[PDB]
């Protein structure tokens, strides 16, 4: 097996200074002519010249205008072109190749491919070698001169990176355009697009240098009207990087382009950012609310990469978190600032503690900077992205705003125009740390374990209060469970943001402070603490850890009601839920296994239910926050606290708990659903695509969450409220009417009516698919079969495939049916998908990640499907590696 190891990094024996491309697009072939002006590096030892080149049809190969010949001067095996050393010059030389490739048949959406009527590239991580020969690695930085030619009628818009320097006519209906990108870059940042594209545009003027930047956003003609929010989000993104980081854009022009077929969300190609349509295009009549947040965060992310990834790039792929973790951190800061809602941070935490914590206790567990890979693509993980973001955010929590900015500026300045490593970032943050502490002995060496050590720390707490001395102490322990990466886990540098609440009046007793736990355990003592406080721990979720608060439910309710920090309130709520869930889960489990004729369930705490009511009845409390409190923790969060999980028992647990709370609060839920309507569904800004009210959007989420609860409960006459809700002009509302209708005989009429409302917009139809897929229907398998036959059919669009199947995999009762039929269905889809799109196939494996956490029958059923997929002939390297790792074999 071909394993690359982080410690084996060596610079190349060659240098590529300039790339001159001619990309000639025709109906049934694309011809790529390439000149690399190359040199020998000081690390060269007379080795053969080896270029990556995958699936290329060679027309010609030369060095310095001398034709090289197969079997004599080179070999090519469809993956590497080797030029024997004897024929490799000893100093500056021009390597020329011409290859034929076929975007029209590239269903894998990596390299050059056709997405509906657009030709587009995706080069990160190893796609460039599918366009032409290269030493395809991020430390091989060069300048690019790129000409694209095509039929003019079919492809009137031609784009590549950088300044458009010439446009020309060509006989036979063709035309070309030449682009020069003056910044040194790795090949993974090359892009090209050709299409019948429409655009909206604006001019932006940089804050400090006053450079004029032309901003263009592009799509196919049909969706040109759905482009304006993206443009506004780009303007926001640029202003944020200038205002917070001092960072200005560095070309005269920046293009964003939407395409229908894209493996992930978007891509940061210099000057030419390429997006999945679902992360660039929206309109208020034709998109759900979540699209607006998605577009803001993705546009932001791709723009933030212009410094963190582009101007400072990676030495090698093991450094991925340096760009992605740090870009996600910058995106999240931007997103918090733009939205101004406490739910934006909560939603990042929620995603980490569910999806990423699951990954981190699975056999796929890896540190944010991995030690080895086979397929690069398997590293684009929530660990590398989201844990990485939290590691990058802790620097800000530790240093504070002004010292963080100073550290970041040192990082940017030192490494600008060059490659960088995670050590370079920590080194820069270390110089800021030295400054802040006044002290040159202080270092962040210990901080490096956030990059190397895998797994989630557990941070636990014990308290003492001496009421005569007015002295309170917090004793903190950390522990990380040993795993395959490290048999001994070292203590991390853990910042714990804290306050102290007076429990009789709900007020803050201290200035917020950040405890720095650097040992296995430590005791933190506070004086002049006038009464026994309740601690408010890990405010803002200050480190990526399992928190054990050792607080009573009564103390948690008090934080939930009175604490200032939205995370702590929410976490306190979450912990009360989890205690209840683990208690009722155990009771139901013992009932099943011991075959009991009768048994008891512990009821939901009645003071918690009262606190929920109190919060919900507070007209001045945040509506997004309220939607978090009435929903139980996610199943993927729960599963981290249970071994040998019986998923049907968990489903009975959640249902009892919701029913208990419902039986007390349903009238309060109904009353708030009705009284929220006027502000929730107010049409101010409905025709303005430059403006979104994120608070009002949260009112819609709350109303939609309540309706779901009332619907499942069969609250009297809720059906009329579902009917009226289907007539709202907000797609968030009318698609909600479909899924909550699942509990009624009206489902199938709403199905048809929302189908008709959705079917003429590609992205909205994809949302309708997802809504159908996640419907809480007994007959959900027959409904998937209907989606497959009537709507999905043989689509190779990843959005369509993921929309039909992924939401259903989160149906706890059905996906996990004890027959294994859900496991069998998704394995079939994975295997089918892998034959044309290995990346998407592995995304579709995600439900299998928790296999070894289930009850032993469901474990056996999942492993069987996984070993079956591993036996498929011509399984991709991507899927094989993933499944081998996930099944403890690699
Ligand atoms: C371009 C890629 C190499 C990776 C990455 N993009 C990204 O969209 N990750 C999110 C994602 C993942 C899976 C599915 C979907 Cl639908 C979306 C990124 O960082 N862009 O800047
Ligand atoms: Mg080919
Ligand atoms: Mg995000
Ligand atoms: Mg389509
Ligand atoms: Zn990124």
Tab-separated table of N, CA and C in Angstrom, residues 30 32 53-56 101-115 118-132 136 187-192 259 261-264 267 269 274 317 375-378 380 796 798 802 833-841 843 876 878:
chain	number	residue	atom	x	y	z
A	30	UNK	N	-10.316	17.831	-25.156
A	30	UNK	CA	-9.706	19.101	-24.819
A	30	UNK	C	-8.209	18.842	-24.918
A	32	UNK	N	-4.357	20.080	-24.246
A	32	UNK	CA	-3.641	20.922	-23.303
A	32	UNK	C	-2.173	20.861	-23.674
A	53	UNK	N	0.966	12.619	-13.648
A	53	UNK	CA	0.060	12.799	-14.735
A	53	UNK	C	-0.924	11.627	-14.815
A	54	UNK	N	-2.222	11.875	-14.545
A	54	UNK	CA	-3.189	10.775	-14.335
A	54	UNK	C	-4.218	10.791	-15.478
A	55	UNK	N	-4.235	9.720	-16.265
A	55	UNK	CA	-5.248	9.548	-17.316
A	55	UNK	C	-5.025	10.422	-18.535
A	56	UNK	N	-3.772	10.822	-18.757
A	56	UNK	CA	-3.451	11.761	-19.809
A	56	UNK	C	-3.126	10.940	-21.062
A	101	UNK	N	-7.371	15.237	-22.958
A	101	UNK	CA	-8.193	14.889	-21.830
A	101	UNK	C	-9.645	15.090	-22.261
A	102	UNK	N	-10.557	14.653	-21.402
A	102	UNK	CA	-11.959	14.532	-21.780
A	102	UNK	C	-12.903	14.987	-20.650
A	103	UNK	N	-13.056	16.311	-20.459
A	103	UNK	CA	-13.995	16.811	-19.427
A	103	UNK	C	-15.407	16.368	-19.615
A	104	UNK	N	-15.843	16.193	-20.874
A	104	UNK	CA	-17.207	15.721	-21.148
A	104	UNK	C	-17.574	14.380	-20.468
A	105	UNK	N	-16.577	13.517	-20.188
A	105	UNK	CA	-16.789	12.218	-19.507
A	105	UNK	C	-16.196	12.153	-18.059
A	106	UNK	N	-15.752	13.271	-17.506
A	106	UNK	CA	-15.152	13.287	-16.185
A	106	UNK	C	-16.247	13.480	-15.151
A	107	UNK	N	-16.799	12.367	-14.667
A	107	UNK	CA	-17.891	12.403	-13.725
A	107	UNK	C	-17.366	12.478	-12.290
A	108	UNK	N	-16.049	12.383	-12.110
A	108	UNK	CA	-15.448	12.407	-10.815
A	108	UNK	C	-15.338	13.874	-10.272
A	109	UNK	N	-15.464	14.880	-11.153
A	109	UNK	CA	-15.490	16.319	-10.776
A	109	UNK	C	-14.174	16.734	-10.116
A	110	UNK	N	-13.079	16.145	-10.583
A	110	UNK	CA	-11.748	16.527	-10.170
A	110	UNK	C	-10.909	16.622	-11.477
A	111	UNK	N	-10.075	17.629	-11.579
A	111	UNK	CA	-9.359	17.924	-12.860
A	111	UNK	C	-10.255	18.834	-13.679
A	112	UNK	N	-10.271	18.704	-15.007
A	112	UNK	CA	-11.163	19.500	-15.857
A	112	UNK	C	-12.406	18.702	-16.169
A	113	UNK	N	-13.585	19.292	-15.952
A	113	UNK	CA	-14.802	18.583	-16.168
A	113	UNK	C	-15.926	19.501	-16.623
A	114	UNK	N	-16.975	18.866	-17.119
A	114	UNK	CA	-18.179	19.535	-17.591
A	114	UNK	C	-19.324	19.397	-16.569
A	115	UNK	N	-19.914	20.505	-16.176
A	115	UNK	CA	-20.987	20.523	-15.236
A	115	UNK	C	-22.081	21.263	-16.000
A	118	UNK	N	-21.113	24.076	-18.456
A	118	UNK	CA	-19.908	24.855	-18.025
A	118	UNK	C	-18.738	23.890	-18.008
A	119	UNK	N	-17.600	24.336	-18.457
A	119	UNK	CA	-16.356	23.613	-18.268
A	119	UNK	C	-15.687	24.274	-17.119
A	120	UNK	N	-15.260	23.473	-16.164
A	120	UNK	CA	-14.653	23.985	-14.952
A	120	UNK	C	-13.629	23.010	-14.427
A	121	UNK	N	-12.642	23.533	-13.695
A	121	UNK	CA	-11.639	22.737	-13.042
A	121	UNK	C	-11.834	22.699	-11.525
A	122	UNK	N	-11.387	21.601	-10.937
A	122	UNK	CA	-11.112	21.482	-9.526
A	122	UNK	C	-9.757	20.785	-9.366
A	123	UNK	N	-8.760	21.502	-8.869
A	123	UNK	CA	-7.392	21.031	-8.773
A	123	UNK	C	-6.965	20.615	-7.347
A	124	UNK	N	-7.548	21.181	-6.282
A	124	UNK	CA	-7.154	20.731	-4.912
A	124	UNK	C	-7.836	19.381	-4.646
A	125	UNK	N	-7.129	18.398	-4.086
A	125	UNK	CA	-5.670	18.453	-3.784
A	125	UNK	C	-4.754	17.961	-4.972
A	126	UNK	N	-5.194	16.939	-5.706
A	126	UNK	CA	-4.362	16.293	-6.774
A	126	UNK	C	-5.073	16.218	-8.133
A	127	UNK	N	-5.936	17.189	-8.359
A	127	UNK	CA	-6.599	17.348	-9.638
A	127	UNK	C	-5.768	17.946	-10.775
A	128	UNK	N	-4.741	18.750	-10.475
A	128	UNK	CA	-3.980	19.403	-11.575
A	128	UNK	C	-3.288	18.355	-12.479
A	129	UNK	N	-2.816	17.275	-11.876
A	129	UNK	CA	-2.169	16.201	-12.624
A	129	UNK	C	-3.123	15.506	-13.569
A	130	UNK	N	-4.428	15.726	-13.447
A	130	UNK	CA	-5.391	15.211	-14.406
A	130	UNK	C	-5.632	16.156	-15.549
A	131	UNK	N	-5.056	17.346	-15.498
A	131	UNK	CA	-5.110	18.290	-16.597
A	131	UNK	C	-3.792	18.225	-17.416
A	132	UNK	N	-2.649	18.200	-16.729
A	132	UNK	CA	-1.343	18.129	-17.389
A	132	UNK	C	-0.260	17.644	-16.418
A	136	UNK	N	3.109	17.634	-8.749
A	136	UNK	CA	1.832	18.124	-8.254
A	136	UNK	C	1.858	18.072	-6.721
A	187	UNK	N	0.058	24.471	-7.813
A	187	UNK	CA	-0.906	24.140	-8.860
A	187	UNK	C	-2.324	23.893	-8.356
A	188	UNK	N	-2.520	23.566	-7.076
A	188	UNK	CA	-3.850	23.246	-6.590
A	188	UNK	C	-4.772	24.488	-6.625
A	189	UNK	N	-4.167	25.672	-6.799
A	189	UNK	CA	-4.857	26.940	-6.918
A	189	UNK	C	-5.081	27.403	-8.363
A	190	UNK	N	-4.661	26.620	-9.360
A	190	UNK	CA	-5.069	26.859	-10.741
A	190	UNK	C	-6.512	26.593	-10.968
A	191	UNK	N	-7.167	27.447	-11.737
A	191	UNK	CA	-8.540	27.213	-12.180
A	191	UNK	C	-8.768	27.800	-13.578
A	192	UNK	N	-9.778	27.238	-14.233
A	192	UNK	CA	-10.266	27.654	-15.537
A	192	UNK	C	-11.763	27.326	-15.604
A	259	UNK	N	-21.330	26.559	-10.012
A	259	UNK	CA	-21.539	25.419	-10.893
A	259	UNK	C	-22.468	24.422	-10.237
A	261	UNK	N	-22.455	21.039	-10.389
A	261	UNK	CA	-21.869	19.779	-10.006
A	261	UNK	C	-20.529	20.045	-9.357
A	262	UNK	N	-20.464	19.812	-8.047
A	262	UNK	CA	-19.283	20.141	-7.281
A	262	UNK	C	-19.265	19.235	-6.073
A	263	UNK	N	-18.110	18.631	-5.810
A	263	UNK	CA	-17.997	17.658	-4.734
A	263	UNK	C	-18.173	18.172	-3.306
A	264	UNK	N	-17.763	19.400	-3.054
A	264	UNK	CA	-17.792	19.969	-1.726
A	264	UNK	C	-18.517	21.343	-1.837
A	267	UNK	N	-14.147	26.603	-3.493
A	267	UNK	CA	-12.704	26.425	-3.678
A	267	UNK	C	-12.077	27.755	-3.922
A	269	UNK	N	-9.506	29.285	-5.548
A	269	UNK	CA	-8.535	29.519	-6.646
A	269	UNK	C	-8.279	30.997	-6.760
A	274	UNK	N	-14.497	29.168	-7.018
A	274	UNK	CA	-15.514	28.341	-7.708
A	274	UNK	C	-16.343	27.690	-6.592
A	317	UNK	N	0.936	18.615	2.468
A	317	UNK	CA	-0.491	18.369	2.797
A	317	UNK	C	-0.741	18.023	4.268
A	375	UNK	N	-4.719	8.418	0.483
A	375	UNK	CA	-5.441	9.329	-0.409
A	375	UNK	C	-5.665	10.622	0.410
A	376	UNK	N	-5.058	11.680	-0.106
A	376	UNK	CA	-5.166	13.038	0.391
A	376	UNK	C	-6.571	13.524	0.788
A	377	UNK	N	-7.513	13.179	-0.062
A	377	UNK	CA	-8.905	13.513	0.006
A	377	UNK	C	-9.561	13.001	1.282
A	378	UNK	N	-9.017	11.959	1.901
A	378	UNK	CA	-9.580	11.451	3.149
A	378	UNK	C	-9.222	12.286	4.389
A	380	UNK	N	-9.696	15.724	4.453
A	380	UNK	CA	-10.546	16.867	4.500
A	380	UNK	C	-11.682	16.574	5.471
A	796	UNK	N	-25.947	11.989	-11.695
A	796	UNK	CA	-24.583	11.897	-11.181
A	796	UNK	C	-24.182	13.167	-10.441
A	798	UNK	N	-23.674	15.219	-7.368
A	798	UNK	CA	-23.567	14.978	-5.910
A	798	UNK	C	-24.657	15.643	-5.051
A	802	UNK	N	-26.735	13.232	-2.384
A	802	UNK	CA	-26.658	13.540	-0.967
A	802	UNK	C	-28.056	13.984	-0.390
A	833	UNK	N	-22.044	4.839	-6.523
A	833	UNK	CA	-21.405	6.123	-6.623
A	833	UNK	C	-19.888	6.018	-6.849
A	834	UNK	N	-19.271	5.035	-6.214
A	834	UNK	CA	-17.797	4.902	-6.254
A	834	UNK	C	-17.291	4.600	-7.653
A	835	UNK	N	-18.153	4.084	-8.520
A	835	UNK	CA	-17.742	3.762	-9.850
A	835	UNK	C	-17.502	4.992	-10.730
A	836	UNK	N	-18.151	6.111	-10.408
A	836	UNK	CA	-17.886	7.384	-11.102
A	836	UNK	C	-17.390	8.563	-10.219
A	837	UNK	N	-17.556	8.531	-8.876
A	837	UNK	CA	-17.168	9.685	-8.014
A	837	UNK	C	-16.728	9.159	-6.671
A	838	UNK	N	-15.486	8.676	-6.588
A	838	UNK	CA	-14.948	8.168	-5.309
A	838	UNK	C	-15.062	9.165	-4.134
A	839	UNK	N	-14.908	10.467	-4.370
A	839	UNK	CA	-14.965	11.388	-3.210
A	839	UNK	C	-16.336	11.389	-2.577
A	840	UNK	N	-17.356	11.423	-3.424
A	840	UNK	CA	-18.718	11.468	-2.941
A	840	UNK	C	-19.107	10.155	-2.314
A	841	UNK	N	-18.583	9.047	-2.860
A	841	UNK	CA	-18.839	7.725	-2.284
A	841	UNK	C	-18.432	7.650	-0.822
A	843	UNK	N	-18.007	10.302	1.221
A	843	UNK	CA	-18.916	11.138	2.009
A	843	UNK	C	-20.151	10.341	2.419
A	876	UNK	N	-12.249	2.151	-5.492
A	876	UNK	CA	-11.304	3.204	-5.546
A	876	UNK	C	-10.357	3.152	-4.358
A	878	UNK	N	-9.686	5.676	-2.628
A	878	UNK	CA	-10.281	6.564	-1.644
A	878	UNK	C	-11.219	5.788	-0.721
